[PDB]
Amino acid sequence: QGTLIRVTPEQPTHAVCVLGTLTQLDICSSAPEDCTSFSINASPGVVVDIAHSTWPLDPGVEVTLTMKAASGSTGDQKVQISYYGPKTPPVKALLYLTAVEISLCADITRTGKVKRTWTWGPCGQGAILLVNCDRDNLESSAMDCEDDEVLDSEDLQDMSLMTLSTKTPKDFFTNHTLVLHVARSEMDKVRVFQATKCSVVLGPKWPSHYLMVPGGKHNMDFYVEALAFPDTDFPGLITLTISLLDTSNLELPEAVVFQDSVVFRVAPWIMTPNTQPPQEVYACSIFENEDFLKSVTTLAMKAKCKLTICPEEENMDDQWMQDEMEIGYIQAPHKTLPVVFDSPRNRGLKEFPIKRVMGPDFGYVTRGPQTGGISGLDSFGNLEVSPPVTVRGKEYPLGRILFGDSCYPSNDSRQMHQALQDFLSAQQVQAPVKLYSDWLSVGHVDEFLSFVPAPDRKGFRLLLASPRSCYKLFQEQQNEGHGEALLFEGIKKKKQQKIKNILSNKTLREHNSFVERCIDWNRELLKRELGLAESDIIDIPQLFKLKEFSKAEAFFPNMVNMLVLGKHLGIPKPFGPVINGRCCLEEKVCSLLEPLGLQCTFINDFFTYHIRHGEVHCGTNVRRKPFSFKWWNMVP
Amino acid sequence: QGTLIRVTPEQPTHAVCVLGTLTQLDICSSAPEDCTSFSINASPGVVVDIAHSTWPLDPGVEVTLTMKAASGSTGDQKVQISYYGPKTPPVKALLYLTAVEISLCADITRTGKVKRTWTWGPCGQGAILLVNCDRDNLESSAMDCEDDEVLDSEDLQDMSLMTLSTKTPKDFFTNHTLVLHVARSEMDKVRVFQATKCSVVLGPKWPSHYLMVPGGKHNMDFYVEALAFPDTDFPGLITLTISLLDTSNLELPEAVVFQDSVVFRVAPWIMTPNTQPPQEVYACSIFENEDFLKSVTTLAMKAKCKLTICPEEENMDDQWMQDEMEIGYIQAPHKTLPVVFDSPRNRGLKEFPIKRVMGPDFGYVTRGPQTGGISGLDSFGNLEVSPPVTVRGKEYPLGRILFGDSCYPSNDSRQMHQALQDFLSAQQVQAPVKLYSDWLSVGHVDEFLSFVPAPDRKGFRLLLASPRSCYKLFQEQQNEGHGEALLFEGIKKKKQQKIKNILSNKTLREHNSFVERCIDWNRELLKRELGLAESDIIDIPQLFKLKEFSKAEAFFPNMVNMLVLGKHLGIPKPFGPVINGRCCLEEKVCSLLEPLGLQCTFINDFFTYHIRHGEVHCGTNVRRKPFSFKWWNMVP
Ligand SMILES: [Ca+2]
Ligand SMILES: [Ca+2]
Ligand SMILES: [Ca+2]
Ligand SMILES: [Ca+2]
Ligand SMILES: [Ca+2]
Ligand SMILES: [Ca+2]
Ligand SMILES: [Ca+2]
Ligand SMILES: [Ca+2]
Ligand SMILES: [Ca+2]
Ligand SMILES: [Ca+2]
């Protein structure tokens, strides 16, 4: 700030001056009469400036004091103002100053070291703070930040450092006291520890704390954790303030002399798209799925990934590893860690995120009502993210979250729960886009899109399911002699059908025109909101049929619902018509993908997953590498 | 948006094209073989564009259709694509188009007439919507917007107009349907009425509505009201959407064809500073205050103001008209109306805002817990606003709200309730500033500041209470012979004191140094946050003393706590030392104010108000003229 010191010949004045502060002088209020002019003389550690030698005694004239260094003792710097006039002997007003240094410091340049406002972008400022939502404590099943103690030294690596740096005379804190505080509004969102061993000084219970500080040169280290992610009621800033109080008069209340602040922004939860290199894969084991599990095991091994499996005792028969969770991350200059977003779906895999995923350097977060009020659209096969894109100038360097919705709300429409929606939006940095998925029986955007790395263009392709393309392929085969070829060749317990009867079935053709249409609507929506061109998009041949409530399901295994482990795709096995020794569906897919350097492996998921209304993507999950681009450098 | 139509020689295609929309053509997907080139021919109402005569049949080549006018009948515009090759006779693919107009319209230019996003500023766009928080209904004591009916025609003037403008063939709605909707997230915040007489189509109960629209040319008028002010969980935007659905296939679900939206911003509650021309004044009548009431009556009459009084039967002895309410306004292009913010203080004047102020063209709003959890800092003598100012470039054309707080939170500090704080901030346009007032026993910023019109500089002065200035004045008088002069001259039942004993009382001098200090701290705070210079500020001579919990009270009537009715000030009567026939306090004040064209009237409030810990400003309230500057033209 800036202080105004009023000087009088009546008696001398005593004041404290914090370094970095503007101190000004009121010379005229009490300038004695007889008097027409003034002079200022000061000790060597005080710099004096005068705008608008000696000067006329006029109120518009400005006098500023600056101190070069901290005082060694109370009052060791002096200012002497000399008032004089025509026939008037000089009279002197004295000012005794004590200079001190109070610096509250944090990593405001976002460089992992330490020594106003929060601003976004690469030319911006303000420190970052992580929610302490992992469990480094190897004992209990609580997030570290739910209690008031630092129980491991490792826990500190998740915390942000703030240092208070003081330089005062040795007895300065006889008569002054420092208090560190946070607004009541924000105390339930942060916890601060003093390092001495660590002790809580601010938190949900305490909004202010008197600091114990010795005179002279001192440095005090604090460790800060956040306890809440940005959300609809929390923009994500936390301000911590230091105040210096004069406690000199034993009769009177303490008087504020100086305040300074640092502003932290809480790190958002961020997702990783399929174009980010994989690191660990998840699945269930259940009745008769060893074969599915080996193809996945193989593909992991090829993509250099840890693998992780959830045995059927923990599963409670729940095979949809995709739906109960989404693995994202949080990121600060000093620490990056994965964090699992746990869907309130809460079916058999309910405990997997709490017990098995959350842990040392693995964060946890959840939203929505846990015991009801849910829909299928809250399952995280309905939550995806695009690769980085730029839309008409505006960069989305972390992509844009995509999630499925209805086209308008009715008695029969579904939506992802508002709390989930509001959370995703409040993260800001992946500006969510609503797509139309409620036309699908299950209702997940993973049932009609996926993304894959590409060596050229923007670095990926969007893949969309396409009846159009499956009709064209089948028509071409009939034209070229193979109308007799059988869909579902390789499956007993199942009624095969020939290309000619598929092409001539008019109901099926109607149902797929309606689906082509729901999907074309998203096509354009994605084109507008991700700035895609047709050459970013590849159509996968895929038929659907309509069923209960005229909702869409896959007619054969939904190939777009694939596992993407870098260049190694785990695509559902369509069991197409076998022509010249190969399924023409597999051949068609391979011909669209292999020129992008992609390897397609067709995994059989038919009786295990497909007849249960999901495929390979729905049966699995992937942790992937965080973006290199730093979220705080975006300007959302 | 933008649609993509796929053409085939297989059979003809039928599509609807909304005017204002980009329609593109996929020529290559189903282009027959033999074929190398194409030509397009269309009817006269279709404009065809082709980037990247006849053309090579190559997917990168772009074809766009535009329609000039609405169709008179289904399929009355045609497009014919001709595929041909080296030795290949032309084959034709047909496209039959129906053009229609769907325009959802609102006052997006903010000009009171009608015929994307919401953007601030004078070069911005987006319609405004008022909260319907008055009571034009002369019957009940409910806000108009609490029910689902328009019970007066006058009520409609508070509402915003939206018009749906359609142009279609006569049978178009045989096979298509229009639905108007709002997100579930925002349905509890808006109500929409169809004009036919008015019937509710959207609201807290209903998020979508099938519209009944005739083919041909039609115009349908809707009336919209908001039900909630911007707040911490509501940024203040409301989006209303129209969707066109194809209902042609009786077997299949409806298919979205077109959506458009309008975005409304809800008008914020805005305060008026003392520098705005007054229009109506408020007070109580109680035991023995007729004399106070006549001086106010006089001053009103001089300032051309309605006057309004609350008799003691309604009062329940509560005299502090200032504290229970604050009169602001809301403002849209079509309608401006005052609105009372009712403090949850809830003392004797509890009913006055509900019954007596709220009414025809008088709005109502309230916040905070009504039956407890309050402090004195929630009384609206602790809520003020500055005049317009510009702070280091940034304009605050409506001023900045100011409210008192503690310097940091402790077991003994008070604050204005968070809900009140959060409301004020969410209004955005008067970016509140926190001042330090908790050092006062009552704790209101009106106890130490006020603002007054000035003919020069920035158009006002800030007035601050000043012990410094009262010591200087009293000292000057003692110096000039009048040390014997008696403070409280004119008051029996009261112990007079002489200037010499006042000047020499050291405790009193200490207490006032502590007060000088609390006030100097705000001085600088105001200087920084309102960009004020010393020449904007005038010090009023005022002494204090400390009492219970070392909290400050006024030693004589607090003159800064005045009623400002344009150039006519109602200043508390200090009862100063009478020197050369006049109170030197009155004379000093008059000498600082009269050169600004201000008329000072000193009203005696001593036994009525002052000994009850408040003055003239605390006993009264004022409605004032809304700013001329339009809030939506600010860029907060
Ligand atoms: Ca802990
Ligand atoms: Ca931790
Ligand atoms: Ca769960
Ligand atoms: Ca950790
Ligand atoms: Ca997912
Ligand atoms: Ca009504
Ligand atoms: Ca009304
Ligand atoms: Ca009230
Ligand atoms: Ca009205
Ligand atoms: Ca007020």
Are the C-beta atoms of residues B171 and B150 closer than 8 Å to each other? no
Q: Would you call B480 exposed, middle or buried from its count of C-beta atoms within 10 A (0-12, 13-18, 19+)?
A: exposed
DSSP string, A448-491: TEEEEE-SSTTSEEEEEEEHHHHHHHHHHHIIIIITT-EETTT-
How many C-alpha atoms does B148 have within 13 Å on its Cβ side?
10
Residue in B59, B232, B472 closest to A233 by CB: B232
Q: How far is CA B149 from CA B161, B186, B283, B605, in A?
A: 16, 19, 35, 48
Residue in A233, A408, A534 closest to B208 by CB: A408
Residue in B255, B439, B550 closest to A514 by CB: B255
Q: How far is CA A171 from CA A166, A168, A179, A219, A270, in A?
A: 13, 8, 17, 17, 49
- Distance in angstroms (rounded) separating the CA atoms of residues A526 and B222: 32
State whether A511 and B1 contact (CB < 8 Å): no
How many C-alpha atoms does B143 have within 13 Å on its Cβ side?
20
Helices vs. strands in chain A: H and E counts, helices first: 10, 41
Distance A380 CA to ligand 5 centre (A): 4
First to last CA, chain A: 30
How remote is the C-alpha of B586 from its chain's centroid?
A: 38
**Which of B209, B444, B511, B617 does the annotation list as catalytic?**
B444
Are the C-beta atoms of residues A522 and A450 closer than 8 Å to each other? no
- Distance in angstroms (rounded) separating the CA atoms of residues A264 and A118: 7
Which are the contacts of B44, defined by CB distance < 8 A and separation ≥ 6? Answer: none
How many C-alpha atoms does A631 have within 13 Å on its Cβ side?
28
- Distance in angstroms (rounded) separating the CA atoms of residues A560 and A251: 77
Question: Which residues does chain B have within 8 Å of residue A514's beta carbon, measured at their own beta carbons?
Answer: 249, 252-253, 255
Distance B321 CA to ligand 10 centre (A): 10
Among A346, A292, A286, residue whose Cα is nearest residue A312: A286
The ligand minimizing its distance to the Cα of A159 is 2
Among A494, A498, A486, residue whose Cα is nearest residue A578: A486
DSSP string, B275-318: TSPEEEEEEE--TT-HHHHHHHHHHHHHHT-EEEEE-HHHHTT-
Which are the contacts of A402, defined by CB distance < 8 A and separation ≥ 6? Answer: A383, A384, A385, A386, A432, A433, A435, A445, A449, A526
Question: Which residues does chain A have within 8 Å of residue B546's beta carbon, measured at their own beta carbons?
Answer: 252
- Distance in angstroms (rounded) separating the CA atoms of residues B45 and B22: 15
- Distance in angstroms (rounded) separating the CA atoms of residues A444 and A376: 8
Among A452, A462, A487, residue whose Cα is nearest residue A473: A487
How remote is the C-alpha of A432 from its chain's centroid?
A: 13
DSSP string, B347-365: SGGGGIIIIIISBTTBEEE
Question: Which residues does chain B have within 8 Å of residue A208's beta carbon, measured at their own beta carbons?
Answer: 408-410
- The beta-carbon contacts of B52-61 under 8 Å, at least 24 apart in sequence, are B57/B27, B57/B28, B57/B31, B57/B83, B58/B28, B59/A534, B59/B28, B60/A535, B61/B27
Q: How far is CA A568 from CA A278, A462, A602, in A?
A: 10, 16, 11
How remote is the C-alpha of A290 from its chain's centroid?
A: 37
- Distance in angstroms (rounded) separating the CA atoms of residues A138 and A136: 6
- Distance in angstroms (rounded) separating the CA atoms of residues B328 and B341: 7
* Residue of chain B minimizing CA distance to A529: B1
By residue count, chain B amounts to 636
- Distance in angstroms (rounded) separating the CA atoms of residues B508 and B516: 12
User: Which 8-state DSSP code applies to residue B483?
Assistant: T
Are the C-beta atoms of residues A277 and A624 closer than 8 Å to each other? yes
Q: Catalytic: A34?
A: no
Among A191, A205, A88, A77, residue whose Cα is nearest residue A145: A191
Q: Catalytic: A618?
A: yes
State whether B207 and A468 contact (CB < 8 Å): no
DSSP string, A346-387: -SGGGGIIIIIISBTTBEEEE-S-TTS---GGGSGGGEEEPP
Question: Which residues does chain A have within 8 Å of residue B421's beta carbon, measured at their own beta carbons?
Answer: 185
Among B311, B260, B261, residue whose Cα is nearest residue B287: B311
Among B305, B147, B228, B202, residue whose Cα is nearest residue B624: B305
Are the C-beta atoms of residues A224 and A128 closer than 8 Å to each other? no
Sign (positive or negative) of CA dihedral A39, A45, A47, A53? positive
- Distance in angstroms (rounded) separating the CA atoms of residues B320 and B339: 19
What phi and psi, each to the nearest 5 degrees, are found at residue A205?
Answer: -85, -35
DSSP string, A540-568: EE--EEE-GGG-EEESS--TTS-EEETTE
- Distance in angstroms (rounded) separating the CA atoms of residues B325 and B318: 13
Are the C-beta atoms of residues B447 and B541 closer than 8 Å to each other? no
- Distance in angstroms (rounded) separating the CA atoms of residues B184 and B187: 5
Q: Catalytic: B456?
A: no
Could you tell me if residue A562 is left (phi over 0), alpha (psi between -120 and 50 degrees) or otherwise beta?
beta
Structure token pair of residue B110: 């903010």
Distance B86 CA to ligand 1 centre (A): 79
Vertex A160: Cα angle to A155 and A164 (nearest 5): 120
Please tell me the experimental approach by which this structure was elucidated. Answer: X-ray
Ordered domains of chain A (ranges, CATH) = 1-105 (2.60.40.1860), 106-266 (2.60.40.1700), 267-636 (3.75.10.10)
Residue with tokens 């942000």: A160
- Distance in angstroms (rounded) separating the CA atoms of residues A501 and A522: 30
Structure token pair of residue B19: 């005017």
Q: Catalytic: A520?
A: no
Q: How far is CA A397 from CA A140, A530, A543, B247, B339, in A?
A: 37, 12, 34, 40, 45
Distance A6 CA to ligand 9 centre (A): 54
- Distance in angstroms (rounded) separating the CA atoms of residues A118 and A131: 18
User: Which 8-state DSSP code applies to residue B471?
Assistant: H
User: 3-state DSSP call for residue A574?
Assistant: coil
**Which of B378, B446, B536, B539 does the annotation list as catalytic?**
B446
Rounded-to-5 percentages of helix, strand, coil across chain A? 20, 35, 40
Distance B143 CA to ligand 7 centre (A): 8
Which are the contacts of A199, defined by CB distance < 8 A and separation ≥ 6? Answer: A193
Which are the contacts of A131, defined by CB distance < 8 A and separation ≥ 6? Answer: A145, A225, A226, A227, A228, A229, A266, A267, A330, A363, A365
Among A145, A139, A241, residue whose Cα is nearest residue A185: A241
- The beta-carbon contacts of A26-31 under 8 Å, at least 24 apart in sequence, are A27/A57, A27/A61, A27/A63, A27/A81, A28/A57, A28/A58, A28/A59, A29/B468, A29/B472, A30/A6, A30/A93, A30/B472, A31/A57, A31/A83
Task: List, in sequence order, the alpha helices (H) in B363-466.
Answer: 418-426
What phi and psi, each to the nearest 5 degrees, are found at residue B605?
Answer: -130, 20
- Distance in angstroms (rounded) separating the CA atoms of residues B296 and B308: 11
Q: Would you call A33 exposed, middle or buried from its count of C-beta atoms within 10 A (0-12, 13-18, 19+)?
A: exposed
Sheet of A335-342, strand order: A325-332, A335-342, A363-366
- Distance in angstroms (rounded) separating the CA atoms of residues B204 and B186: 8
Q: Would you call B302 exposed, middle or buried from its count of C-beta atoms within 10 A (0-12, 13-18, 19+)?
A: middle
Q: What is the number of other CB atoms lying within 10 angstroms of the CB of residue A256?
A: 18
Question: Which residues does chain B have within 8 Å of residue A408's beta carbon, measured at their own beta carbons?
Answer: 179, 181, 208, 241, 243
Structure token pair of residue B198: 């008015």
